[PDB]
Amino acid sequence: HHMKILLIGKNGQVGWELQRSLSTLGDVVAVDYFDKELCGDLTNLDGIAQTVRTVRPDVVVNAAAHTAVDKAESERELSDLLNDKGVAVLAAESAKLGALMVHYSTDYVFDGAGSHYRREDEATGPLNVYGETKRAGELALEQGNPRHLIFRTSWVYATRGANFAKTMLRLAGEKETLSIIDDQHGAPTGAELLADCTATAIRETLRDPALAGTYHLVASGETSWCDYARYVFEVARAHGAELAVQEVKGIPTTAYPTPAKRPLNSRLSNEKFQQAFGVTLPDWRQGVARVVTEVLGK
C-alpha cells in the first residue's frame, strides 16, 4: 500500500523540488493553477476543496502562495485568498480526512526588530501584506487542522525559478557596480533543503505525530543581501564565469524605499527543527554555491 500525497503549487521553486523529494513517500498527485483535470487554483476555494475531496490524500503539501511581496501591497484581496483563505480551506478539508498538512510561511511574519535568531513562539507582528496574510494563514491552519507542519523559511532560491541569486548573476553580467541592501540579515534557504527536510519531517511526523507544529526551517548562519550577492559572484568567478561587476556597494534599506516595508532582522533559529527531526542544517553558503554552479552549467 502507498500513501496518497497531494502537492499544491508544484511548479514553484519549492514545489519543483518537492516533486522529487515526495516521490518516494507514496503516490503523488501534483497540481498547480493551470491543471485542467483537477483544480489546482488555490484562489478557487470550491475547486481546490473538490480536489482534496477527490484525491483523498493522506498528506497535503501546500507549496502555492502569493510571493510577490511588493505587488502584494496593491493586491491585498489576492494575497488574502492565496495565503489565508485558501490555506483555511486546505486545513478544513485535510482535517476532515485526517490528513497531515504541510504549509510554508515566512520570516516576514515578524517585525524585524533585534539581532537575535528568533524562536518559533516569539510574538508575530508583520510589517507588510505578505507577512500579514501569511500569518493569518498560519493561524487558520493551527485552528483548522491540528495534524500539521508549518515551516517558516526565508530568502528562498533554486536553480529553477526566479530569485535573488539568479537575478544578481544576470545583473553582474551587465553592470559594473551594484548597490545592494546591507542592513537586512537572514539565511538564504534553498528549495533543495526545504524539499528534502520536508520529506524527512513528514516521515518522522507520521511515525511520531507529537512532532506536529511550527518550525523555522532555514539554512544555518546569516548574511546581508549585499554579502550574499558578493558570495554569488565569488562562486561564479571560481567556476570561470566572466562578470562585469567590479564593486558591490552596501546601502541601507532607507536609501531606496519599496512599496512593502521590510523587516531588518530576518534571522530565524533553526534549532527546534534540528532537534525534533535529527537533521543537520548546513551553513547557507553550501546550497547557494551549488545553485550558482548548476545555473552556470558547471
Ligand X SMILES: NC(=O)c1ccc[n+]([C@@H]2O[C@H](COP(=O)([O-])OP(=O)(O)OC[C@H]3O[C@@H](n4cnc5c(N)ncnc54)[C@H](OP(=O)(O)O)[C@@H]3O)[C@@H](O)[C@H]2O)c1
Does the annotation flag 286 for ligand binding?
A: no
* Distance in angstroms (rounded) separating the CA atoms of residues 108 and 101: 21
Find how far residue 87's CA is from the centre of its chain: 15
* Distance in angstroms (rounded) separating the CA atoms of residues 82 and 88: 10
For the chain, the first-to-last Cα distance in angstroms comes to 40
Catalytic pick from 104, 130, 157, 228? 130
The interface mask with ligand X, positions 138-157, x = CB under 6 A, is ---------------xx-x-
| Main-chain phi, psi angles of 176, to 5 degrees | -80, -25
Our CB check for ligand X shows the closer of 13 and 270 to be 13
Instruction: Tell me if residue 148 falls in helix, strand or coil.
Output: strand
Our CB check for ligand X shows the closer of 104 and 215 to be 104
C-alpha cell at 158: 533554486
Does the annotation flag 106 for ligand binding?
A: yes
Does the annotation flag 166 for ligand binding?
A: no
Our CB check for ligand X shows the closer of 125 and 161 to be 161
* Distance in angstroms (rounded) separating the CA atoms of residues 111 and 31: 33
Respond yes or no: is residue 130 known to be catalytic: yes
Our CB check for ligand X shows the closer of 108 and 215 to be 108
Instruction: Tell me if residue 114 falls in helix, strand or coil.
Output: coil
| Residue among 5, 7, 13, 136 that touches ligand X (CB under 6 A) | 13
Residue 98 site contact among ligand X, Na ion, none (CB < 5 to 8 Å, cut-off depends on kind): Na ion
Shortest Å distance, C-beta 40 to ligand X: 6
For Na ion (CB under 5 A), the number of binding residues is: 1
Shortest Å distance, C-beta 240 to ligand X: 29
Cell 487542522, located at residue: 145
C-alpha cell at 251: 546601502
* Distance in angstroms (rounded) separating the CA atoms of residues 221 and 212: 25
- Among the residue ranges 18-26, 77-85, 97-105, 202-210, the one whose residues contact Na ion (CB under 5 A): 97-105
Shortest Å distance, C-beta 247 to ligand X: 28
Instruction: Tell me if residue 167 falls in helix, strand or coil.
Output: helix
Task: Name the residue number minimizing CB distance to ligand X.
Answer: 12
Shortest Å distance, C-beta 125 to ligand X: 15
State the alpha helices, DSSP H only, in the chain: 13-21, 45-55, 69-72, 76-80, 86-97, 129-144, 164-174, 191-207, 225-238, 271-277, 284-295
**98 near Na ion, rule: CB under 5 A:** yes
Shortest Å distance, C-beta 82 to ligand X: 6
Task: From 130, 104, 137, 141, select the one nearest 268 (Cα to Cα).
Answer: 104
* 86-105 positions binding ligand X, by CB under 6 A: 104
Does the annotation flag 215 for ligand binding?
A: no
DSSP 6: E
Active-site residue set: 130
Q: Which residues are annotated as a binding site for NADP(+)?
A: 13-14, 32-33, 41-42, 65, 106, 134
Which residues here bind ligand X, judged by CB under 6 A?
9, 11-15, 32-33, 40-43, 63-65, 67, 82, 104, 106-108, 153-154, 156, 161
Write out the residues near Na ion by the rule CB under 5 A: 98
